[PDB]
Design a protein around this ligand. Structure first.
Ligand code: PLM
Ligand code: PLM
Ligand code: PLM
Lengths: 108, 110
């Protein structure tokens, strides 16, 4: 169901963010607003890659905003859908800083 | 060098063919000016792809919506259908700045 699916994707993002070495080489320093479209409503999360924290909310001036459907997120996570294909199919909506967006695409 | 010249001309002819194909009054979602910087061994080839007016010109635009910096061989492969824009990004082959919405809308239309 929706809640288990959302919880799963968020825990996976939290694991990846926690795996970053704060002092190691880093390219993606920004705050990402994540809007997850679900059949029930939108789940709103803040992925702060500068401070390395993931919190629920809507950040005031995110560097990048990402809006994507839940099922597509799960597909990208399990590698049944590539980011380039998701892009080609118009499955991701972005606003904000193109540089930070491109650098994110490189590390997913 | 002739090899570089032919590759650049081919890239630009292809972009011009594509932009000339667009119906000015049909559905359009990529309305912006893209600065295209193509790195070669002979220096940077600088081109303005204006998708608002649907013109391609050599030059450096003062304030483009998106700047795209890409190597010659990668840009050749992208224009020749052998490298997808998507895989280019994943591989870190494109440098972007500016408007993410317009960058993504462009990745959708090719
Ligand atoms: C909110 C945008 C969509 C979801 C963001 C994906 C987050 C998954 C984990 C990202 C790991 C970032 C790697 C950082 C290393 C670096 O800065 O170079
Ligand atoms: C212009 C480039 C767009 C880049 C944005 C890519 C989409 C970000 C959201 C994809 C979800 C990835 C989360 C999966 C986390 C994981 O399983 O490791
Ligand atoms: C960013 C990678 C390379 C960029 C080079 C631009 C490629 C030529 C652009 C042609 C796209 C024309 C389609 C636009 C129609 C529309 O606005 O919906």
């Amino acid at each position: 169901g929706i809640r288990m699916s959302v919880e799963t994707i968020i825990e996976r993002i939290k694991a990846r963010v926690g795996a970053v070495d704060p002092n190691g080489p880093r390219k993606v320093l920004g705050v990402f607003q994540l809007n997850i479209k679900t059949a029930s409503g939108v789940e709103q999360w803040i992925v702060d890659l500068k401070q390395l924290k993931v919190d629920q909310g809507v950040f005031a001036s995110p560097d990048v905003t990402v809006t994507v459907g839940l099922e597509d997120m799960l597909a990208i996570s399990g590698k049944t859908l590539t980011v380039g294909d998701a892009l080609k199919q118009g499955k991701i909506e972005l606003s904000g800083d193109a540089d930070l967006a491109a650098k994110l695409a490189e590390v997913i």
